């Protein structure tokens, strides 16, 4: 996996030394090319994980997330063009350095072969995200945003540190393959449930579940437009990879211990959907819908079902794409209006004919309608949860009952109706935006046509 990591690491001096205005161009081009190299990794041999070295390995679970991150890096890269055109050249290169280091640490996490290295790079993501959120933020509460995000993630992570060093001392190794192959039944001992809690709560923290979901709403709102999509897109899914890999040792104790959090997700995905009918900010709207989708993926994980795993694996990719998709639109409207109020500007279709079209398929993908991979990822979870506990379909039906009520509500109160008469600075949509949502939505259906790749590693 040096093939894709080394280009990213060595790309850094290019941005840090190139000319004051070619840095955007060169970073964009080389990001598209290392993403090109990345999609060659979609190959997965039989059931064997694609091994590369003693420290780096990948599989069908990893590959979609890897090529995801490589595909995004250009997206916030050229989304940053508007918001960073007026700041100093050295700060521009530093911002690009932050993004590149973030992507590097992501592809390091996802290819990790041994647990504690995955953990080191798992916490290595906060530093770039914290820097991006705090420095290049816009409003005042961004400082408390960084505090909440950093402290929440750490307070989750440290128990996982103690648990992992304990696993290494006891079992003998933390390599993924061996602990899957040398797995043993985690008994119902009173130390074992705290073992499980330490190995689970860390990932649950950066997978906002009901109750412990304040950092995302209070950080994504005023995070920089480029950063916000990165938080909402990937770092909620590295935790999902964490569950995907750590649940191989947490059985069979997961059978009955998962129940408190399990239901805390289903009712949770209703409340964060129920909260989602009433938001004064569009960014908070997308954040709460995202929280609902991650509660869905959480209950997908905790059942331990191959169909649940497939629905999850599809759901991380689908939700990340759609969430960043909507966040781009929120950025565009805010930047034109220099505010983030919900009902400030309705009826934008009367001014930007193609922008509300983008809004339309963005919400439609948020709807999870067939045959989009959002629907198929949800549907596998529907089937798994039904086979789990019969009635679960009632609560999850309430979720596929609220999702569109808020998604299309956002359309009717942003794009449909008529423009508010006071605002008059809304110019024609620049090709940068509509181009970026084009590169966002078209591959969303392209890989929908080929769902095997993102379907899951249990295929």
């Amino acid at each position: 996996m040096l093939k894709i990591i080394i280009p990213t690491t060595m790309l850094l001096p290019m941005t840090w030394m190139s000319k004051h205005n070619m840095i955007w161009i060169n970073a964009t081009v080389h990001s598209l090319l290392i993403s090109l190299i990345s999609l060659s990794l979609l190959n997965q041999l039989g059931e064997n994980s694609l091994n590369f070295s003693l420290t780096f390995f990948s599989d069908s679970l990893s590959a979609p997330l890897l090529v995801l991150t490589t595909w995004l890096l250009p997206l916030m890269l050229m989304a940053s063009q508007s918001h960073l055109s007026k700041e100093t050249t050295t700060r521009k290169k530093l911002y690009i350095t932050m993004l590149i280091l973030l992507q590097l640490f992501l592809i390091m996490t996802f290819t990790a072969t041994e647990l504690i290295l995955f953990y080191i790079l798992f916490e290595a993501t906060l530093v770039p995200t914290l820097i991006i959120i705090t420095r290049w933020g816009n409003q005042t509460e961004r400082l408390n945003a960084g505090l909440y995000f950093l402290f929440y993630t750490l307070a989750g992570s440290l128990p996982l540190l103690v648990a992992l060093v304990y696993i290494q001392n006891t079992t003998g190794s933390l390599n993924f393959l061996i602990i899957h192959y040398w797995s043993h039944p985690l008994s119902n001992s009173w130390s074992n449930i705290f073992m499980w809690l330490a190995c689970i709560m860390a990932f649950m923290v950066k997978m906002p579940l009901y109750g412990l979901h304040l950092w995302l709403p209070k950080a994504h709102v005023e995070a920089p437009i480029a950063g916000s999509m990165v938080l909402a897109a990937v770092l909620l899914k590295l935790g999902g990879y964490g569950m995907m890999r750590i649940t191989t040792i947490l059985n069979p104790l997961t059978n009955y211990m998962a129940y408190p959090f399990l239901m805390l997700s289903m009712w949770g995905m209703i409340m964060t959907s129920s909260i989602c009918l009433r938001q004064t900010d569009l960014k908070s709207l997308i954040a709460y819908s995202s929280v609902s989708h991650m509660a869905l993926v959480i209950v997908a994980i905790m059942i331990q079902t191959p169909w649940s795993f497939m629905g999850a694996t599809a759901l991380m990719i689908a939700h990340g794409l759609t969430s960043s998709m909507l966040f781009c639109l929120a950025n565009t409207n805010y930047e034109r209006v220099h505010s983030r109020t919900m009902i400030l500007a309705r009826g934008l279709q009367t001014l930007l004919p193609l922008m509300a079209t983008w809004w339309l398929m963005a919400s439609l993908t948020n709807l999870a309608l067939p045959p989009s991979i959002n629907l198929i990822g949800e549907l596998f979870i529907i089937t798994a949860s039904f086979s789990w506990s019969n009635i679960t379909i009632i609560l999850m039906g309430m979720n596929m009952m609220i999702t569109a009520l808020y998604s299309l509500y956002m359309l009717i109160t942003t794009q449909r109706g008529k423009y508010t008469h006071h605002i008059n600075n809304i110019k024609a949509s620049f090709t940068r935006e509509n181009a970026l949502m084009a590169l966002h939505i078209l591959p969303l259906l392209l890989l929908t046509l080929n769902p095997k790749m993102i379907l899951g590693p249990l295929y």
């Binding site: 009433r278 009902i343 309705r346 109160t413 109706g417 008529k418 508010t420 008469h421 006071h422």
Partner: protein, 156 residues
Amino acid sequence: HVTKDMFPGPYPKTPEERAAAAKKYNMRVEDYEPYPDDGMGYGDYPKLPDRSQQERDPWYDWDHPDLRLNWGEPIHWDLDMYIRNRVDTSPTPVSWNTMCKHLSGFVAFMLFMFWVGEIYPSYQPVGPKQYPYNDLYLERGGDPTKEPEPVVHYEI
């Protein structure tokens, strides 16, 4: 651009506080009153009576004609509640309790009658269907080994 008087702040408890909050929401002190003190973060926000925007005058020159709102006026905590698209407080022809009586004496009544209809379904004076070969046993999900008594019928 901004001051503190038009930032929502503390819950008013003295007439000077009521006047300050009245200015804060650009609506007079005498008809100013906040929501109850029952710790919902109500603060100085006035309990604007729960009416909708459908009840106002559409013909009026509202500066926000889409929702019949006006440029810089106090709006209800649940304005998005009572928008034209969402729930409306526009009056119904008769008393709301009579609407409830109507809906109940409709649905519950009829359901009683569908119960009585389904316990005495309408029936016409005919007889058996006269299916041979044990009601087509072997030819509709019949075990080849099983050979039950064939249901046979005679004309009359």
